[PDB]
Amino acid sequence: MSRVQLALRVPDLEASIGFYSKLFGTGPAKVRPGYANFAIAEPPLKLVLIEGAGEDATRLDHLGVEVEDSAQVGHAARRLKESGLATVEENDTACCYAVQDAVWVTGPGGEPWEVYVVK
Ligand SMILES: O=[N+]([O-])c1cc([AsH2])ccc1O
Numbered sequence: 001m002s003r004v005q006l007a008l009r010v011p012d013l014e015a016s017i018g019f020y021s022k023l024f025g026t027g028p029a030k031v032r033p034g035y036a037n038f039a040i041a042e043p044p045l046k047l048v049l050i051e052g053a054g055e056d057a058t059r060l061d062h063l064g065v066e067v068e069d070s071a072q073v074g075h076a077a078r079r080l081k082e083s084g085l086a087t088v089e090e091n092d093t094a095c096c097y098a099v100q101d102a103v104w105v106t107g108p109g110g111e112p113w114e115v116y117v118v119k
């Protein structure tokens, strides 16, 4: 039972939390200066808002697939490595108010993806 992760670099975090509460009909799961997240049931979605220091507009920070356990993260790592993708693995790695196992790739046009579990 995994979900898409969508992490956005937003110019106004406060306006953004406001807007996403309305769009999804639910408040954030977590709020800390310069960061918020929403854990959305339908559609399955982890929405990450990161506050950008003076960009004009919202832009993509990264994308992701949140899996159920580290076991799934490692399957995904081996499978992606086997398909010929350049990968970067991380274990028990702090970051944004959580600990995660993750594997990272980048699409041809430079957009970053992580397959990850939050521990
Ligand atoms: O790419 N990252 O490692 C990354 C990780 C976290 As946590 C937040 C923003 C980012 O761009």
Ligand SMILES: [Cl-]
Pocket: 058, 059, 060
């Ligand atoms: Cl963008």
Ligand SMILES: [Fe+3]
Pocket: 007, 048, 096
């Ligand atoms: Fe993140």
